[PDB]
Amino acid sequence: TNLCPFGEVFNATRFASVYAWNRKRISNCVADYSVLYNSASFSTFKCYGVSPTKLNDLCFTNVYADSFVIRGDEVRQIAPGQTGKIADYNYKLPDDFTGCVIAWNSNNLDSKVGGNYNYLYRLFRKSNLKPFERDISTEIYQAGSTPCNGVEGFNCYFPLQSYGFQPTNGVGYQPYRVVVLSFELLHAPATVCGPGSH
Amino acid sequence: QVQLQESGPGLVKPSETLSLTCSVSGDSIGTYYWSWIRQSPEKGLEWIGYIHHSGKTNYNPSLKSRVTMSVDTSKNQFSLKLTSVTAADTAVYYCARSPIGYCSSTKCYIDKPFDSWGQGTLVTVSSASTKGPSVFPLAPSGGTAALGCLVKDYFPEPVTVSWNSGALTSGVHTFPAVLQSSGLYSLSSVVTVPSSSLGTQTYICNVNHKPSNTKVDKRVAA
Amino acid sequence: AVLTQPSSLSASPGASASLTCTLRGGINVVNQRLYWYQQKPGSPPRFLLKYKSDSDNFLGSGVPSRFSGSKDASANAGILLISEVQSEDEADYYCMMWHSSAYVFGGGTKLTVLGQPKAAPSVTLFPPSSEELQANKATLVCLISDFYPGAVTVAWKADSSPVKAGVETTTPSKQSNNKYAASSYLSLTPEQWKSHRSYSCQVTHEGSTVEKTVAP
Numbered sequence A: 001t002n003l004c005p006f007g008e009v010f011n012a013t014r015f016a017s018v019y020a021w022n023r024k025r026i027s028n029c030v031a032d033y034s035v036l037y038n039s040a041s042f043s044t045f046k047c048y049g050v051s052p053t054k055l056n057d058l059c060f061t062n063v064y065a066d067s068f069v070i071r072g073d074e075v076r077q078i079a080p081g082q083t084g085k086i087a088d089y090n091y092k093l094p095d096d097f098t099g100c101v102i103a104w105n106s107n108n109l110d111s112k113v114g115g116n117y118n119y120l121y122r123l124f125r126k127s128n129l130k131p132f133e134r135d136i137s138t139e140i141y142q143a144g145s146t147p148c149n150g151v152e153g154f155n156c157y158f159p160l161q162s163y164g165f166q167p168t169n170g171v172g173y174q175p176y177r178v179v180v181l182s183f184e185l186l187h188a189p190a191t192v193c194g195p196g197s198h
Numbered sequence B: 001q002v003q004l005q006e007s008g009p010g011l012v013k014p015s016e017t018l019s020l021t022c023s024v025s026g027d028s029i030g031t032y033y034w035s036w037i038r039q040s041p042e043k044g045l046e047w048i049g050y051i052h053h054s055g056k057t058n059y060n061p062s063l064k065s066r067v068t069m070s071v072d073t074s075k076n077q078f079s080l081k082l083t084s085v086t087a088a089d090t091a092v093y094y095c096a097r098s099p100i101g102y103c104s105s106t107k108c109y110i111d112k113p114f115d116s117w118g119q120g121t122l123v124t125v126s127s128a129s130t131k132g133p134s135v136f137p138l139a140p141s142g143g144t145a146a147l148g149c150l151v152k153d154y155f156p157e158p159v160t161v162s163w164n165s166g167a168l169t170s171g172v173h174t175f176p177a178v179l180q181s182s183g184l185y186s187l188s189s190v191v192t193v194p195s196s197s198l199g200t201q202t203y204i205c206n207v208n209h210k211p212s213n214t215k216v217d218k219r220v221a222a
Numbered sequence C: 001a002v003l004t005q006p007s008s009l010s011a012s013p014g015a016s017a018s019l020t021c022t023l024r025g026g027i028n029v030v031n032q033r034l035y036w037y038q039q040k041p042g043s044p045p046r047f048l049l050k051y052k053s054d055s056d057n058f059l060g061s062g063v064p065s066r067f068s069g070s071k072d073a074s075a076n077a078g079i080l081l082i083s084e085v086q087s088e089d090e091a092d093y094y095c096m097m098w099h100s101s102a103y104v105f106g107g108g109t110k111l112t113v114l115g116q117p118k119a120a121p122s123v124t125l126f127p128p129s130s131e132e133l134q135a136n137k138a139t140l141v142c143l144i145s146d147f148y149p150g151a152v153t154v155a156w157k158a159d160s161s162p163v164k165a166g167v168e169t170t171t172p173s174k175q176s177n178n179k180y181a182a183s184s185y186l187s188l189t190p191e192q193w194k195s196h197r198s199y200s201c202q203v204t205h206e207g208s209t210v211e212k213t214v215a216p
């Protein structure tokens, strides 16, 4: 009878940076997805591997709720088979993803006059991330021949960059809050179901 | 020293009867006529009529058809009854005393009409239902601090606010009410106190909405 | 209208103010007994004096001799003379007479005593209490007081941008001591409140802008 704590994820005052994206495990509850897509407060609401039409009729072993903030025009990358700084170096979905990606513009909350420099993303990495991989290292990135060591220098970049989130930015560069729901259906009894399922 | 005290404020349904009582106490050296006077939201004044100690009455010709005044000398009280009321009768109602002055053989004159007044009572004529307020504490954020409480969504006016059952009077600023597009009123009352008392002094705002017979005491803590 | 007084009158301190009460055309002012009352906000009116003529009049006990009555038959008007006007004479002044079996008053003349000094507003902004949020409602209360003159502009800002929806602002009214106070209410949904970094009440008065800000 207990409902899933979607409010603890969607209605969270704090959202992590994308490079350090947050994940929460949801289990043993009823996920009334009707409450989600009925709300007109999401700029994007895209499901993969399952029609949203009948979300509330399905069960899953476990559901993971990943959340972070990214640039508005970077919301395109939170999807299977996409490329870019985010998908390559910060948050990667598997090619056969089953779940939904929900986003909404959080300019009124995450921007700042002069700039909110606490939301960072990874600029460089020696190789793309694997799906659902999280890279928080701050070690200097060697872009050239010289093997630099702990000193910012020519072709030796500090791997993270701050978004300059300001209220006045164009819509494309405004902060957006995204929560990825992954529907984990293993070979075990499902512990999260919708309201109108058998 | 005379003191006129009018009955409490309230709401009257359209076409029903408005009734008020003035209670008199204090020095009464002479002979007096007693009167009701109402004041409109725009501060216009209109005399309704007066009544003698004997019970004889003289009414305003424009209200005579709906007004009854009466006196209970034994209780030092006189009353007003105004029937078939409408929204035009929404007003602050005052009782007032006027002394008898020079009396010739054929006439007594009132030289100083309306010697003494009550504080006035707001009577609201309206079809709508009384509604008690929702009281919300306004928690306290130099060395002084501001705290208060919010009196929201009541009808009709007025509402009285005190602090600590009136024991706290200095620094108490109760603001005039605002009227919302819903027809309900809201006001706020704030008290300025030294921050040194926030951890030791109890602050409790007393809200009294007579028209709804509502009394709320809200403790306002840090 | 049996009795007509001007809506407002302004006079300098130490000056004299001649408050007029013009009787309707078909009623001769020469014979009439006129009565004048002073009312300050929050109090009932207060008898000042009767005036019929220089020989028939009445001055209430404790009423300054600075108050005197006269009549102007030309204008068919009664006059309340306030000599050496003071700041504490600021009030609404009513003329009254008996006519057609009833006391009738004029509309009241509000006296403005000029030369009161400026006073900067005190502004306090309260966020929605947890109780109200818990009740699925949200009100910001901005209280402004202790200012003169009473011309105030109040603006609300969600984050750093203007907001006009959901605003209720009272008309500034003189508290005791002849200063002014005013209230402004901004109603929000709990969601509007929690999805913004902050809200601001901005009060501009006499070349200065006080801004308080609250956030969750």
Ligand SMILES: *[C@@H]1O[C@H](CO)[C@@H](O)[C@H](O)[C@H]1NC(C)=O
Residues within 6 Å of the ligand: A005, A006, A007, A008, A010, A011, A035, C190, C191
């Ligand atoms: C977040 O709170 C709003 C009410 O402010 C509610 O309608 C919504 O359902 C909540 N989010 C979730 C995921 O339940």
Ligand SMILES: [Cl-]
Residues within 6 Å of the ligand: B024, B071, B072, B073, B076, B077, B078
């Ligand atoms: Cl009596």
